[PDB]
């Protein structure tokens, strides 16, 4: 389990886990880039539109997406 | 630690961990600029340099983190 947790933390630090920054403020949606292995693009935004709301495209954090998401979830 | 792992698994099974898929390289859905969500469920989007519009993919509702880890370890 410790090896898996270390691998997950390392992936989070490297920006390999694209976790949405939702627990607002619209942000940039940068161009599409493919990953190291695969033809699928790496996501850059978290656009979401409510039934009676507007666009909220908040960019995915690069430093710690999963860590920042968990901190925001705990703080809210 | 183990309790935290089980809590993360429980949150991921319920879809509360929005680890979103790698956007497919070939999506045929009509779209536009990301600031105009023409698609809306919470989706991960990237601006496609070809047409200038955004390619989006909704977050999996069953196991988002698990599916992402499976697809990361499958390549």
């Amino acid at each position: 389990l410790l090896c898996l947790i270390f691998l997950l933390v390392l992936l989070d630090y490297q920006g390999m886990l694209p976790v949405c920054p939702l627990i607002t403020s619209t942000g940039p949606c940068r161009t599409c880039m493919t990953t190291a292995q695969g033809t699928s693009m790496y996501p850059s935004c978290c656009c979401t539109k409510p039934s009676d709301g507007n666009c909220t495209c908040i960019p995915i954090p690069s430093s710690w997406a999963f860590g920042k998401f968990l901190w925001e979830w705990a703080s809210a | 630690l183990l309790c935290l792992i089980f809590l993360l698994v429980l949150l991921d099974y319920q879809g509360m961990l929005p680890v979103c898929p790698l956007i497919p390289g070939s999506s045929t859905t009509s779209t536009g600029p990301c600031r105009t969500c023409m698609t809306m469920y919470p989706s991960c989007c990237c601006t496609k340099p070809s047409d200038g519009n955004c390619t989006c993919i909704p977050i999996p509702s069953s196991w988002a983190f698990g599916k992402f880890l499976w697809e990361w370890a499958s390549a």
Partner: antibody, heavy 127, light 107 residues
Framework: EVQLVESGGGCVKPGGSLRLSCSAS????????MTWVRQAPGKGLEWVSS????????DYADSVKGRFTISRDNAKNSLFLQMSSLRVDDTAVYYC??????????????????????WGQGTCVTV | DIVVTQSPSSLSASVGDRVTITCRAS??????IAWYQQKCGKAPKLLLY???TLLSGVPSRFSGSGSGTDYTLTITNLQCEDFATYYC?????????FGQGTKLEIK
């Protein structure tokens, strides 16, 4: 450009066998569920078979169940439909379509269903 | 196993007009209907999926609506390119049953 081109269509004696080879260009078949849809002359569209991304979920229409055999090749990026014991009622134009994108383990609930977003060109099979 | 009736069998309309095509499933498919357009002797092209989402290269004139079992495809403005046969397909559960098809002719 996303495109599918199938082949192996032609006149076949009743009770014979044909194999349709649907290649794809502009994308990959590795993470997509592929589908066959036929259209009899003067009739409507009809689902034939569908194969999951890793050949685990194979479904056939009740009319062609048991005879047909769908099989993908992600390494070669090509779908195939082996038709066996073709009845006189199987003459139709067959389209290979792209139904659903897999994200995760290969279960029917892990697909993103966009309902046959790109269609092939259609090969005529005349019995 | 799902009987998906499509109506009308054929309908005529002027060069500029609003035309609605109805698709009624045997049982609820939960907003999982798709509309395809098949021109004269060509492969059908997906117009709508998820009952509302347009597809790239599809004109904005086409729209979808309805819910539960009854769904509609609406073309608010017609044109010579809109001469084709329109099929509704349910992809809620296998088998993916298509509609019978409606022939649209410009009058």
């Amino acid at each position: 450009e996303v495109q599918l081109v199938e082949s192996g269509g032609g006149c076949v004696k009743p009770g014979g066998s044909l194999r349709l080879s649907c290649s794809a260009s502009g994308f990959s078949l590795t993470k997509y569920k592929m589908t066959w849809v036929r259209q009899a002359p003067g009739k409507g569209l009809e689902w034939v078979s569908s194969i999951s991304s890793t050949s685990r979920d194979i479904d056939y229409a009740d009319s062609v169940k048991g005879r047909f055999t769908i099989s993908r090749d992600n390494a070669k990026n090509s779908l195939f439909l082996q038709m066996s014991s073709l009845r006189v009622d199987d003459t139709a134009v067959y389209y290979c379509t792209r139904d659903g994108w897999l994200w995760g383990w290969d279960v029917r609930s892990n697909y993103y269903y966009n309902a046959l977003d790109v269609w092939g060109q259609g090969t005529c099979v005349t019995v | 196993d799902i009987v998906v009736t499509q109506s009308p069998s054929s309908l005529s309309a002027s060069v500029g007009d609003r035309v609605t095509i109805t698709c009624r499933a045997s049982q609820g498919i939960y907003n999982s209907i798709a509309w395809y357009q098949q021109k004269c002797g060509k492969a059908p092209k997906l117009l709508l999926y998820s009952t509302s989402t347009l597809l790239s290269g599809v004109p904005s004139r086409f729209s979808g609506s309805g819910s539960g079992t009854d769904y509609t495809l609406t073309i608010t403005n017609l044109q010579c390119e809109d001469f084709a046969t329109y099929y509704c397909q349910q992809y809620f559960v296998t088998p993916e049953t298509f509609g019978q098809g409606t022939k649209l002719e410009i009058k």
